[PDB]
Design a protein around this ligand. Structure first.
Ligand SMILES: Nc1nc2c(ncn2[C@@H]2O[C@H](COP(=O)(O)OP(=O)(O)OP(=O)(O)O)[C@@H](O)[C@H]2O)c(=O)[nH]1
Ligand SMILES: [Mn+2]
Ligand SMILES: [Mn+2]
Ligand code: NA
Length: 613
């Protein structure tokens, strides 16, 4: 067992028992306790008592504040250094770089960031030894997906952050039921530290532990490990959220024949009581959570939310593409959320919700840019930097990507099948981003192969810059993007597969004065209606060089007589000639030797159709 007394950590367990853990879970826990040297080990049970007590503890320490206007809601303000851009510090380790990213023809890859095993071991050894001294190591057993779903996967996160424990309780299914379900099965090992052992070597800013200089978020898919150091925030610390959900899961999906994607899942029911599930991939700032929670303007239509951010999808034996939301909550952007843009989110977030980096009103409510509602005379605002703040100051009151973290079970339009273990059958997949010019409101891909190309060719506005963001997965590919494209294409050769219809949307086209041509939000229900009929086989499309678009009079524009359908659906030869050239250069450089034949063929075909305009 040991010749001395430093290997068995049983004496330091303050909740639970090392003896009751599955064998490999114990090894993971105790091995990392030996390395990181926590004071205590707390095996989380996921109970309400655990949660409430931990929140009250963070409140007493000043790590969070209670938002007294609402029911059991809380506010955390971070060190502003811990929400800087850290993609340069997000890496995947594999034996061969080409398995992680394609080797580009001319430039640096924008499709991921590889780190060698050797460089990672050095980075690891310079960070983790002793990193939890004086702190509790929490052990978070969690399921990504409904417990017992054939599509669910289990993780164990070790963390020294109570904020992570509380947020993981919301965003995943956490606690004793998961350990019991796991037994001696496989799981993803998730190791997290804020990187600030006690006694603190550097000043603590805003009661928010982090280590920006050593921040590193690493994924080791061939070891089934996620190892994250130095950040307490978001996808860097809630290791289910992106690390597991997309980066590790996309690699597992490649190995196992399924898909892990940055997609909402919604259910839409028409006035004839027919319901279809749709998935949609848009980048950050492009409105997945607005769509997923849409309040439709068209009478007799209903939208319900399965998930707002991650989809895990697998063709079943019957050929249906079955999707689950592997999350348990919504980790939504707060700024821009209003009664106009997302009324269902406004309803959801007034109880049991943790907010990070938003402003606080003097009566204990929340505030942010784009909230689009006034404060009673008297009510004052504290910014996310803990300073008094007034409407006409230059600095925003909330961080621009500040977040709410809310239980999915509270959404008033949560779908009745949102945690069905079998998943929901996807009939359409939608791509899109911000395109101020050139790209119509909606078009439909001509085939599966064309649809994969449409995903691959996605671009979005960041002077303005238009960047590529294929499949809305640019930050998140777990492996070589060319091999991901081949994996998508391979779905067409699968037995019985019912390949969903693929569409591309653009909510963001602008006129010459910079005004949005389309009102969007709940009005996007009109576009969903057209997609719905297309899936049913309706003769509602006209062929163009980029795909099918709605026929004249096919789109329901009742209540929107002022919309300029001609500018909104216009397709210019000049624009599209440039577009195809841009996509060609991008795919050649960035995908290079790993570009599938079928994607190059779709590029050639689009070029040719544009040439005949
Ligand atoms: N004009 C217009 N803007 C929209 C529409 N839907 C959403 N937005 C804008 O999209 C932004 C919100 O998108 P985010 O919450 O960042 O997008 P997301 O896809 O949920 O992002 P993540 O949560 O980071 O994955 C705000 O600027 C909204 O005003 C629309 O239909 N029209
Ligand atoms: Mn979102
Ligand atoms: Mn996201
Ligand atoms: Na703080």
């Amino acid at each position: 067992p040991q010749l001395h007394n430093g290997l068995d950590f049983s004496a330091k367990v303050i909740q639970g028992s090392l003896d009751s853990l599955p064998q490999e879970v114990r090894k993971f826990v105790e091995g990392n306790a030996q390395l990181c040297q926590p004071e205590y080990i707390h095996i989380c049970d996921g109970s309400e008592e655990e949660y409430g007590r931990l929140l009250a503890h963070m409140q007493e320490e000043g790590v969070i504040r209670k938002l007294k206007k609402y029911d059991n809601c809380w506010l955390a303000l971070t060190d502003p250094r811990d929400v800087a851009r850290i993609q340069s510090k997000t890496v995947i380790i594999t034996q061969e770089q080409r398995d992680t990213v394609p080797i580009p023809k001319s430039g640096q890859s924008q499709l991921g960031r590889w780190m060698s095993e050797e460089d990672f071991e050095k980075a690891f050894n310079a960070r983790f030894p002793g990193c939890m001294k004086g702190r509790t190591m929490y052990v978070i057993p969690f399921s990504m997906g409904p417990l017992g779903s054939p599509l669910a996967k289990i993780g164990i996160e070790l963390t020294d952050s109570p904020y992570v424990v509380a947020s993981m309780r919301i965003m995943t299914r956490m606690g004793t039921s998961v350990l019991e379900a796991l037994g001696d099965g496989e799981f993803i090992k998730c190791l997290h530290s804020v990187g600030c052992p006690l006694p603190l070597k550097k000043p603590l800013v805003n009661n928010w532990a982090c280590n920006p200089e050593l921040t590193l978020i690493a994924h080791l898919p061939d070891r089934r490990e996620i190892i994250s150091f130095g950040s307490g925030y978001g996808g860097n610390s809630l290791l289910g959220k992106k690390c597991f959900a997309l980066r590790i899961a996309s690699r597992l999906a490649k190995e196992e024949g399924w898909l892990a994607e940055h997609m909402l899942i919604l259910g839409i029911t028409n006035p004839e009581g027919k319901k279809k599930y749709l998935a949609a991939a848009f980048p950050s700032a492009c409105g997945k959570t607005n769509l997923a929670m849409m309040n439709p303007t068209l009478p007799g239509w209903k939208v319900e939310c399965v998930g707002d951010d991650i989809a895990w999808m697998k063709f079943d034996a019957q050929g249906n593409l079955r999707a689950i939301n592997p999350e348990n909550g919504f980790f939504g952007v707060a700024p821009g959320t209003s009664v106009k843009t997302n009324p269902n989110a406004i309803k959801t977030i007034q109880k049991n919700t943790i907010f990070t980096n938003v402003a606080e009103t003097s009566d204990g409510g929340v505030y942010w840019e784009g909230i689009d509602e006034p404060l009673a005379p008297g009510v004052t605002i504290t910014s996310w930097k803990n300073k008094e703040w007034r409407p006409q100051d230059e600095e925003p009151c909330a961080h621009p990507n500040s977040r709410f973290c809310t239980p999915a079970s509270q959404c008033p339009i949560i779908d009745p099948a949102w945690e069905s273990p079998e998943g929901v059958p996807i009939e359409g997949i939608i791509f899109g981003g911000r395109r101020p010019a050139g790209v119509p409101l909606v078009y439909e891909a001509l085939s599966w192969q064309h649809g994969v190309f449409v995903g691959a060719a996605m671009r979005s506005e960041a002077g303005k810059v238009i960047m590529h963001d294929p499949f809305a997965m640019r930050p998140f590919f777990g492996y070589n993007f060319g091999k991901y494209l081949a994996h998508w294409l391979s779905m067409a050769h699968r037995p019985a597969a019912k390949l969903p219809k693929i569409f591309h949307v653009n909510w963001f086209r602008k006129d010459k004065n910079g005004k949005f041509l389309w009102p969007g939000f709940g009005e996007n229900s009109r576009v969903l209606e057209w997609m719905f009929g297309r899936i049913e086989g309706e003769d509602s499309a006209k062929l163009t060089p980029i795909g099918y678009v709605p026929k004249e009079d096919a789109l329901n524009l009742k209540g929107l007589g002022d919309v300029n359908v001609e500018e909104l659906f216009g397709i210019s030869k000049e624009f599209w000639e440039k577009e195809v050239e841009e996509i060609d250069k991008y795919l050649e450089d960035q995908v290079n030797a790993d570009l599938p034949y079928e994607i190059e063929r779709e590029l050639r075909a689009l070029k040719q159709r544009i040439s005949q305009m």
